[model samples]
Target: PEIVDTCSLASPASVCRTKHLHLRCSVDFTRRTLTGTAALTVQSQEDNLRSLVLDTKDLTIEKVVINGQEVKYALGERQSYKGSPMEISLPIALSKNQEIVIEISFETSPKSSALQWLTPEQTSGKEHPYLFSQCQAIHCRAILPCQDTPSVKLTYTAEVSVPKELVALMSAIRDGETPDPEDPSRKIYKFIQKVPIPCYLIALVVGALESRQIGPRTLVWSEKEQVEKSAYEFSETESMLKIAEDLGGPYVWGQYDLLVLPPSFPYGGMENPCLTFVTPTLLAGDKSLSNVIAHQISHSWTGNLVTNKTWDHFWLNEGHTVYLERHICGRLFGEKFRHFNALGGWGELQNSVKTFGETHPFTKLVVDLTDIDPDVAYSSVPYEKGFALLFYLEQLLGGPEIFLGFLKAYVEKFSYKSITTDDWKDFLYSYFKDKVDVLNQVDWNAWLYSPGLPPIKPNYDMTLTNACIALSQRWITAKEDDLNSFNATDLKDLSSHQLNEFLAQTLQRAPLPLGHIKRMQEVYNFNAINNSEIRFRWLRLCIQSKWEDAIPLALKMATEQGRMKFTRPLFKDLAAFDKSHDQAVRTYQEHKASMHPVTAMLVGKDLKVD
Candidate 1:
């Protein structure tokens, strides 16, 4: 019997697995289109394989080629989330060891969810149009014809032709480029990824981009306007990579560059192998939010190298990444800071759980994504909840020192491979065979399958979080006259993380009095600070108190960057206010065009629109 990735429309892994993929494509800014041919070198997983199926969404398939000859194929009916499956009949039966190249000629349609075509005005540099691809979850099918599941990992090379005035980049190392023979104004940029990565990590961007080398192997790319800021913000990219490598393993991906995408990139950071994609929102000026860099750097090992078999086991990628990220945090900052971050994450997990209710299946570690869009089921539950389970195991399985060794072993065992949660569990039991009794005492069902919060909580070090707790209590318990006690001096000594935690703690509370936020604005001056994290929390806090002044700023932030983590919640909060209900819908309607399809789609659902 074989299992299937319900979120993917690709054929079974038992039949075939991708080995190498070569993408030859033209990026057309004028038509907002991608015309491409994906050449996949695949190996038969079993005997007598006679056909190959590739996932595609809104793609116009011109033909399929094998060995220089066109082959007969059929594109199946499209589904809401799984996309269409294109099946190409093989001329000959392939044995288990046989390898064949299937080339697919396709052109992207306007409905391609993976590509976000930005008009000149949508970009920071208003001179040239820009385009970027976000292929995580099931969107990769919208970009090219291939198995869009993370279950199969493969090395790939891409050749993308774009206007000579703009630069093209992919989630791979920069190879040399040449001018297009047919078009004088366009240059074909080439890239190669020696490391095997999931199709979802196959990212691409074309824009009037500039690069600033921040480290030996790190370059921060963005529009000229934000390039310097991005360079500074991710200056510690090299250091973070080193820390993560020391914790997890070698940084297999040679270059760890950062691209601060235009405001509408729609995620905090995408851990694309060579060229990681970051949002312009993270240009917080003071390095206040560079921890996100640490998180993505950690993915170099966790999600990029050793991956989840399917979207259902996504926690394996994210959860373990968070675990590794905290370890990096612990090594660089301190053990307590890592614990402090975990405490903040726990609060986030609780907040996420409340949004989904106590028993929402999405809150579980192993979610069943059958017929469900991975984007719709996505939340912080897998990340934080997964970390909780690992953190518990670390303590029970002989602390961080012992668990860190296990993590190293785990990465070594699964490097360049995709695996399910059961595979991880099997390794855990084998690695700790000596402690079978202790492991058997664990509640496997509650942690991995059951919903809500984790059954047990690890005791976090409260040294750093204590200050955050104290400050939030002072404001929460303060009376009208007590507002005078709060001033700039109250926050003068708080570290960036502490300040963020303070704001987070306040967010977990009931809405403060409206005057409290007005007073907060007067003193803290979060509005003047360019930190996005602080600004997001401050704006939400103000709106929660029904402060009308924050309405525009909140809306600006939501439209400014379409990152769902911030945008959806902000939109939801604004809609929660009776006065801002119509404003929220109107704002969403006005700006939906600029948002990434996934971001806009989810925000629409949150706004109860089509």
Candidate 2:
């Protein structure tokens, strides 16, 4: 049972119906070891005798028996997918509706020092070296053994064993009580669960993580060093739970606890049920990082509860999460902030979609549950672009209530189960009915299947002019100092019924309205940019505006100090200008290797004489 590349692994057509599994798994945290004996009854779909691969990294297996006989296997080798690697493997010969018994023991080293993120602010490890697995990187296989694919959702019953000094959290509700205080500093804790989940969603977190639990259903983690800050960071959990209950159904898994993991986590956050793995970086010290919390919180429903069956249909997780994020943000932070946040996401997404299309394998890239790296497969595209499309779709569908109502149906319909893209389309079509024609008009098939960025780069265009006008009014109307306070609502009252109305009203009949044109130029002051975001936005607007004159401004702005943030990005594009072709080689060479991945990906140009 050597761990090998799953490249040749096969998909048996969407998620096959799930089978039940009953297991009694034991782990001794003192030695950082795990031993599990399980009885799995699965209903196979394909004719081939394939296996359910449980991925593990450092664990050494004692035995794997199917039924009463031993199954042939070996220790899985280290392999990388999504920046992480795994070292565990399980092999089982299968038949339809067959019952099998698997008995095995494995080991793990609790201390995670190899994977660490350090900042100069941290003086010592005495402050608690916060470390979390970018298991998406490769360690999950060491945690559990199974067919590590999201589409193959299965019901699991676990008997977990961990030292009592720490808490170990999992996917389902815990049934038993606290262990005896025999060790005072140590005891064995066990958790039994019966939740059906995609393998990636299965999580195990252990540490001094304790909850200032509000009620049986609500709990928040408060680290030892900073109780008040941790408490405030988790304070919104209760409100989040209340909103979900009123809007959707009751929370599916009864108990919810937020486990704040070590800051070294590679991801912003991981949406694990019961216990979510989060980065301490999100604490942000001043509550400015609430949105990240909102995102992981919303996952309780969209991602954790109604899970995505496969990576290809990731909108099921990310797109839906983005929608719920805005919904919660609106309820908690007010609609104005929600819209501002929502539209800001759209702006960022447009840039990403354009960038991704121009760089990576954009069209028709592979997406599978085995493709565990969420950031790589769908980071900017799956999350950001997916959010924008859904936001736009919500607008077309009517309003907030209509959009949420549809989501409520989607969630309830597939609660505690897995679904596919066709199922999603079917549901949306059912809800939209004749209105789906609008989707067709927008070319839903092309939208969903089309890979990569659009050929026409976003430039000084009409859409951008409209955005500038809205932003200008937003900037002008608010006390300039409190610009962050200005939100999307301001843009609404400043203009007319549609984007066209604002354009017609401000720019008159010309392609670019004089007022908007002038106001936009001031905002796009690439020459005198002060803020990082303002500089980025100004460059983006100038690009979107596509005004030939804006290129000089963008190129000039590239000379400023703060331009480091947007400098390379704009320079990469500025190099493409017709007038700048002569100096392209030198400029591209200088910035092509720019530190940023996006800018680094673009450095060369093909010369053509016209």
TM-score on alpha carbons, each prediction: 0.98, 0.65
- Top lDDT hit: 1
With candidate 1 superimposed using the best TM-score fit, by how many Å does residue 218's alpha carbon deviate from the native?
Answer: 1.2
Range of the 10 consecutive residues with the lowest summed lDDT in candidate 1: 1-10
Note the Cα lDDT for every prediction shown.
0.87, 0.53
Question: Looking at model 2, which ten-residue stretch has the lowest summed lDDT?
Answer: 601-610
Where model 2 places Cα greater than 4 Å from the true spot, the runs are 1-59, 74-95, 108-139, 157-164, 177-186, 214-216, 354-359, 363-375, 451-610
Can you give the lDDT of residue 420 in candidate 1? 87
Best by TM-score: 1
Query: Candidate 1 at residue 260, lDDT?
Result: 86
Clashes of 2: 34
Model 2 lDDT per residue over 1-610, tens place: 1222342132232212335556555544334345565454555554444554454444555666655666666444445432222221235545555444555544443432112222223312344222223343223444544444565556666655544554555555665645545434444445545566665665555455556665456566635654556667666777776776666667766677776654334345677777666655556454555666678778878876776555666666887787787788779867765665665565555556555664454433224535443334444566755666667677777877888888888888888776766777788889789687676655564456556642222111244345646654543344435544544454444322133223223322223332444454454333353333344444544444445666656655553221223454566555555555445445445533322222232222122211
